[PDB]
Every structure is written in structure tokens, then in C-alpha cells.
Scaffold this active site. Structure first.
Site, short mmCIF file in Angstrom:
data_model
loop_
_atom_site.label_atom_id
_atom_site.label_comp_id
_atom_site.label_asym_id
_atom_site.label_seq_id
_atom_site.Cartn_x
_atom_site.Cartn_y
_atom_site.Cartn_z
N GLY A 210 -47.62 74.17 -7.33
CA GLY A 210 -49.04 73.90 -6.85
C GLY A 210 -49.34 73.24 -5.45
CB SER A 243 -38.89 63.63 2.81
OG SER A 243 -39.67 63.21 3.86
CE1 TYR A 246 -40.99 58.77 -2.85
CE2 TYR A 246 -40.20 59.24 -0.55
CZ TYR A 246 -40.74 58.33 -1.52
OH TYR A 246 -40.95 57.00 -1.20
CD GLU A 327 -44.63 54.69 3.57
OE1 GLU A 327 -45.47 54.45 2.67
OE2 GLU A 327 -43.62 54.01 3.78
C1 FRM Z 1 -44.24 57.91 -0.42
C2 FRM Z 1 -43.59 58.83 0.57
C3 FRM Z 1 -43.31 58.40 1.83
C4 FRM Z 1 -42.66 59.26 2.75
C5 FRM Z 1 -42.26 60.54 2.43
C6 FRM Z 1 -42.59 60.92 1.16
C7 FRM Z 1 -42.39 62.25 0.71
O1 FRM Z 1 -41.69 63.00 1.33
N1 FRM Z 1 -43.01 62.69 -0.36
C8 FRM Z 1 -43.53 61.87 -1.24
C9 FRM Z 1 -43.77 62.27 -2.66
C10 FRM Z 1 -44.40 63.65 -2.82
C11 FRM Z 1 -45.81 63.63 -3.29
N2 FRM Z 1 -45.75 63.20 -4.68
C12 FRM Z 1 -46.67 62.15 -5.08
C13 FRM Z 1 -48.05 62.70 -5.07
C14 FRM Z 1 -48.34 63.97 -5.26
C15 FRM Z 1 -49.69 64.44 -5.57
C16 FRM Z 1 -49.82 65.83 -5.63
C17 FRM Z 1 -50.83 66.47 -6.25
C18 FRM Z 1 -51.81 65.66 -6.70
F1 FRM Z 1 -52.88 66.29 -7.14
C19 FRM Z 1 -51.79 64.29 -6.59
C20 FRM Z 1 -50.72 63.64 -6.03
C21 FRM Z 1 -47.19 64.94 -5.42
C22 FRM Z 1 -45.85 64.26 -5.61
N3 FRM Z 1 -43.59 60.60 -0.92
C23 FRM Z 1 -43.23 60.11 0.27
#
Ligand code: FRM
Length: 350
Positions: A210, A243, A246, A327
Site C-alpha cells: 500500500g 532506514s 526498518y 532524520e
Molecule cells: C522513523 C524513521 C526515521 C528514518 C527513516 C525511517 C524509515 O526509513 N522508515 C521508517 C518506517 C516506515 C514507515 N512506517 C511507519 C509508518 C507508516 C505509516 C504508513 C501508512 C500509514 F497509513 C500510517 C503510517 C508505515 C511504516 N521510519 C524511519
């Protein structure tokens, strides 16, 4: 049978697949055998966001302790834990609560993944790659390998493989270029903000079903703005590491998606500890966490006037801070445009 280039087909079968959806859910504790992801509902998830927000007022505001314990107990019923046994965690601190905020984030893209699924097909004619991929509403080019483009990209995973995270060490399986449908438009506005940057968005895979349909996204209204270091927008990194972690790629699956976004940062709010926002003060158009490593100033390429920080593990002058890498955050969705995917093989050091 499908048409499609060949890691496009595999990309479908990876990002679209039922088993692994259970697997994430499992690792958030979720009790599949209570709550089956036919359950998963936008609905019962959104309600859960309001109970974790329920607990937050109250924790930062004293509260009946005869409230807290049942809001926990509320949090449970609605989102059934396999716990189990052992002594469940109380929603009466910041930490355990934020913990449950990721699971729901994820619940959101996983719903949208499986709930995605359910549509097109007794089909077939048009087989099961081109109907999923068809519903992606996104197009997927395979960057050739030999290209300076694939080349550049691979410097970027290289050089910003960081120090601390080694280890694992890392490699590029495939490299897809993406336009999702109409995202030029939306970003249009933002195609002319200053300070634009290619940065990593890493996420658990189960997500990209998604994110490719919904674009990357931000927590609903319902959700704790305490649930997140910089409140709720959209978080991004310049080291490929912060990243890549994650993806939650482990010893197996060791294999794992990552975005490279264009992001319309403009004026950076530079920050070092947590700020619980969602409202950005005026004139500022993104947040910056100021981690102690910066991608070496020195090396900063820019194709079409996006910066790309494919420069390498250097030390910023921030000692002083809560982070160790930068970040970048943006608080609405238009300010992003997805450019590349990469498939990663995690390769976990000896
Ligand atoms: C912290 C953070 C800092 C720096 C890099 C990253 C990184 O690379 N990705 C993510 C996590 C990915 C996003 N996730 C949390 C929230 C999401 C989200 C998506 C759809 C939605 F509807 C609501 C929230 C998806 C998963 N967090 C990071």
C-alpha cells in the site's frame, strides 16, 4: 501468462504475498488465532488509535489509575494479543505505548495489502501478476544494472552504509524505477520548493503493497502525536542504514525493500530531541533531526537540482543530541515523490 519483465513479477509475488502478512502481525504479538486478518479493519484499527491516545492524555495528565488499567484492557480486547503466556504490558508510560503505535502503522499498510488483494479476480486473463501489479496503480521500470544510474544508486548504499550498522552488510538485487499514477501532479507545487533531496524511506515490505498504491502516508488523526519522535508526518533518512533497519529483515527473510524519495524539504526545522508536532511553525516546511553523522558535505551530487547526499559516513558537529544520524520529516503528503525502489539482500556479517 504475464507479460511483465521478470523481477517485476517477483516484486509482485514478494510485496503481494499472504504468508508474510501473518508474519509481521505475529511479530507485533498479534494473536492470529484470536484475530484473523480477515478481521483487519480500518475501522478496528482506527479505534485502537484512539484508545492509545486515550492513555496518553491520561498518562501525562495524572488520571484515575482505575482508568489506566482499563484502557490497557480496552486496548487488548479490540486488538487481541498472543502473549502468552507471560505478564502483559501496561499503557501507562511513553514507551510501551509507542511500541503499539508501530504495530498499528503497519496494520494499516498490511490491511491495505490484503484488503487490496480481495478485488480483481476470478482471474486469470490477465493472470495473478498482472492484476495485482494492475491494482498497484504504479509502473515499474527495471533500471539496467550497467547504467551510470544503477551505478550512482549503488554508491549511495555503499557510502552511507554506516559504521554502527555494520553489521549486516548490504546488496542490490534489483533496481526499480517508479512513477506512481498522478503523483507528478500533486508534487507539482513542491517541484519548486528550495532544499529538495533524495532520501531513503525504509519500511517492512508488507507496507509496499500500500505504499505503492497509497503512496507513503501519515498517521491518522486518531493517533498519539506522542507516538512518534517528531510527531506525525513522514520520516526519511540520509544514511541507508537508519532506514534499512526498518525492513526487519532477519536471518530469514534476509531480503527487503527500500524507497528512495524526492523530498521537498525547504526550510528545515532543526531539532535534537523530540518535538511532538503535526503543526509546523510558520515559514518552516520540514523537520530536521540532527544526528551526529553527516553524509560528507563535500560529495553532494545533484541531478536536476535535487540534492543527493551519497557522501560518506563523516562526523557532524552535533555531540549534544538524541540521535546519531539525520532524520528528515515532512507534514504533508504532497511534499513527496517516490523515485526508486531497490531490492535488498541483507547479508548478515560473521
Ligand atoms: C522513523 C524513521 C526515521 C528514518 C527513516 C525511517 C524509515 O526509513 N522508515 C521508517 C518506517 C516506515 C514507515 N512506517 C511507519 C509508518 C507508516 C505509516 C504508513 C501508512 C500509514 F497509513 C500510517 C503510517 C508505515 C511504516 N521510519 C524511519
Amino acid at each position: 501468462k504475464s507479460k511483465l519483465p521478470k523481477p517485476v513479477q517477483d516484486l509482485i509475488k514478494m510485496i503481494f504475498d499472504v504468508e508474510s502478512m501473518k508474519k509481521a502481525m505475529v511479530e507485533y504479538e498479534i494473536d492470529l488465532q484470536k484475530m484473523p486478518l480477515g478481521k483487519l479493519s480500518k475501522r478496528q484499527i482506527q479505534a485502537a488509535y484512539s484508545i492509545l491516545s486515550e492513555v496518553q492524555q491520561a498518562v501525562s495528565q495524572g488520571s484515575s489509575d482505575s482508568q489506566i488499567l482499563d484502557l490497557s484492557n480496552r486496548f487488548y480486547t479490540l486488538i487481541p494479543h498472543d502473549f502468552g503466556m507471560k505478564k502483559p504490558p501496561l499503557l501507562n508510560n511513553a514507551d510501551s505505548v509507542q511500541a503499539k503505535v508501530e504495530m498499528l502503522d503497519n496494520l494499516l499498510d498490511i490491511e491495505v495489502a490484503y484488503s487490496l488483494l480481495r478485488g480483481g479476480s476470478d482471474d486469470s486473463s490477465k493472470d495473478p501478476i498482472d492484476v495485482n501489479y494492475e491494482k498497484l496503480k504504479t509502473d515499474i521500470k527495471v533500471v539496467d544494472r550497467d547504467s551510470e544510474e544503477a551505478e550512482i544508486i549503488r554508491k549511495y548504499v555503499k557510502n552511507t552504509h554506516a559504521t554502527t550498522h555494520n553489521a549486516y552488510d548490504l546488496e542490490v538485487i534489483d533496481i526499480f524505477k517508479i512513477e506512481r499514477e498522478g503523483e507528478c501532479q500533486r508534487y507539482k507545487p513542491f517541484k519548486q520548493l528550495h532544499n529538495r533531496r533524495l532520501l531513503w524511506h525504509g519500511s517492512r515490505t508488507t507496507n509496499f503493497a500500500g505504499i505503492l498504491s497509497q503512496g507513503l502516508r501519515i498517521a491518522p488523526p486518531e493517533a498519539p502525536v506522542t507516538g512518534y519522535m517528531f510527531g506525525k508526518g513522514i520520516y526519511f533518512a540520509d544514511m541507508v542504514s537508519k532506514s534499512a533497519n526498518y525492513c526487519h529483515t532477519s536471518q530469514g527473510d534476509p531480503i527487503g525493500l527500500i524507497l528512495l524519495g524526492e523530498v521537498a524539504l525547504g526550510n528545515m526545522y532543526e531539532l535534537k530531541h523530540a518535538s511532538h508536532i503535526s503543526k509546523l511553525p510558520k515559514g518552516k516546511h520540514s523537520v530536521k533531526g540532527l544526528g551526529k553523522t553527516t553524509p560528507d558535505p563535500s560529495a553532494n551530487i545533484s541531478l536536476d537540482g535535487v540534492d543527493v547526499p551519497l557522501g560518506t559516513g563523516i562526523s557532524s558537529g552535533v555531540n549534544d543530541t538524541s540521535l546519531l544520524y539525520n532524520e528528515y520529516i515532512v507534514y504533508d503528503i504532497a511534499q513527496v515523490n517516490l523515485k526508486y525502489l531497490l531490492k535488498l539482500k541483507f547479508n548478515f556479517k560473521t
